[PDB]
Design a protein around this ligand. Structure first.
Ligand SMILES: Nc1nc2c(ncn2[C@@H]2O[C@H](COP(=O)(O)OP(=O)(O)O)[C@@H](O)[C@H]2O)c(=O)[nH]1
Ligand SMILES: [Mg+2]
Length: 416
């Protein structure tokens, strides 16, 4: 079973911890010593729900669960220390999300208001590429009257329209009416909402689609070295990061834009007919002057040439800087196999480190610890890609004085 990292978002008090606690209790792996004590507590109080309350407190004291198809690990949601930094560095990363929305009168409205976190987290989920969001419309037992279809539809309609207005796709968004404390429509079908005829939240989690595999994405091969072999020809070497290279393929070298044909491929001094992601290969290319090939360049197929950036926008964490950095700062960026000086061309905004939202627009400077959106202009043509399109070519380190000054993920490229 594939492992996925899941983030649960939503407004304060809407039911996130409870829902998380319910999933862990019903499909997770709580230690025997903890389960036991929880059962003991429920026994002494003569109330079954005391078990869940006991477990919730234990969990809070401190997170993987299993469904029909997947293994899920619950990770930090916005509001936590290093939330943004960990997503940028790749220390954490969300594969799927559940937005918890309270159906209780007033709560739903507060969450969806201008300053509310339901609206904030939906926009954040859009920035994170969480197109398969599952929206749990929770506290269905607290509508007036309890389990009200009309209130659930109103919420589903309003949230859906809001999402559409933010580009947030929608055909992959699923809504389910639930009650977190009891697991109703979460880990079992509710007997209280006969009007709902859709999948349970766990069933929606099992409907999640895994992202495209590198082998099915366009070819990208960052070049690590290039040699000239007498009587053989030009032989670049690099690791396939996405796509498939095959003997006979026409390929293009960027940034130069030169086209050549692959005559052979080898890995480990062994000829192969095809190379797939992960394969470190030497490949003989006919038609290209070695002077148009260098370490840092990137190969692709002519129909999908590697992107070359005139400018790019990134979300960065400044991990180390002794004073302050400003517009014009020009460190060396290391991205895939390239090492190129890139000038900071705009400090777009600093971000709140716990949430990802904008905090100061156009700051004069960034200091160590800051997270920000920044634009860079490579001093010479540089191949890069958006992180959410080709990860291996979209995360970089800013280096200076032998140290990593910062790490960033690329979120936009102005092609050359
Ligand atoms: N009646 C009812 N209470 C709920 C439900 N979900 C959560 N709660 C309660 O509402 C409060 C807020 O929930 P909490 O999970 O801590 O949400 P959080 O701030 O989003 O993590 C808790 O005190 C729960 O007991 C629900 O579906 N029905
Ligand atoms: Mg909570």
């Amino acid at each position: 079973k594939p492992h996925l990292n899941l983030i649960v978002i939503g407004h304060v008090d809407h039911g996130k911890s409870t829902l998380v606690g319910r999933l862990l209790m019903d499909r997770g792996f709580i230690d025997e010593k903890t389960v036991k004590e929880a059962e003991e507590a429920a026994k002494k109080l003569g109330k079954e729900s005391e078990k869940f309350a006991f477990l919730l407190d234990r969990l809070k004291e401190e997170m993987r669960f299993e469904t029909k198809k997947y293994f899920f690990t619950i990770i930090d949601a916005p509001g936590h220390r290093d939330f943004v930094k960990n997503m940028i560095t790749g220390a954490s990363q969300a594969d799927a999300a559940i937005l918890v929305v309270s159906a209780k009168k007033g709560e739903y409205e507060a969450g969806m208001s201008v300053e509310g976190q339901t609206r904030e987290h939906i926009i954040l989920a859009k920035t994170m590429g969480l197109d398969q969001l599952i929206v749990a419309v929770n506290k269905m037992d607290l509508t007036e009257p309890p389990y009200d279809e009309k209130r659930y539809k109103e919420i589903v309609d309003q949230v859906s329209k809001f999402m559409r207005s933010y580009g947030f796709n929608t055909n992959k968004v699923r809504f389910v009416p639930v009650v977190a404390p009891s697991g109703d429509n979460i880990t079992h079908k509710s007997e209280n909402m006969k009007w709902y005829n859709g999948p349970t939240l766990e069933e929606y989690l099992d409907q999640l689609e895994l992202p495209p595999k590198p082998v099915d994405k366009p070819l990208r091969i960052p070049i690590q070295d290039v040699y000239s072999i007498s009587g053989v020809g030009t032989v670049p070497v690099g690791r396939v990061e996405s796509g498939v290279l095959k003997v006979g393929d026409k390929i293009v070298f960027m940034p130069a834009g030169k086209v050549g044909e692959v005559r052979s491929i080898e890995t480990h001094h062994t000829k192969m007919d095809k190379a797939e992601p992960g394969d470190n290969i030497g490949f003989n290319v006919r038609g290209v002057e070695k002077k148009d090939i260098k370490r840092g360049d990137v190969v692709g197929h002519p129909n999908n040439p590697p992107t070359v950036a005139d400018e790019f926008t990134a979300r960065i964490i400044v991990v180390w800087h002794p004073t302050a950095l400003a517009n014009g700062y020009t460190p060396v960026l290391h991205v895939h196999t390239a090492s190129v000086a890139c000038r900071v061309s705009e400090l777009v905004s600093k971000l709140d480190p716990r949430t990802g939202q904008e905090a100061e627009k156009n700051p004069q400077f960034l200091k160590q610890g800051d997270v920000a959106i920044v634009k860079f202009k490579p001093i010479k043509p540089l191949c890069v890609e958006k992180y959410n399109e080709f990860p291996p070519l979209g995360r970089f380190a800013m280096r200076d004085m032998g140290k990593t000054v910062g790490v960033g993920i690329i979120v936009d490229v102005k092609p050359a």
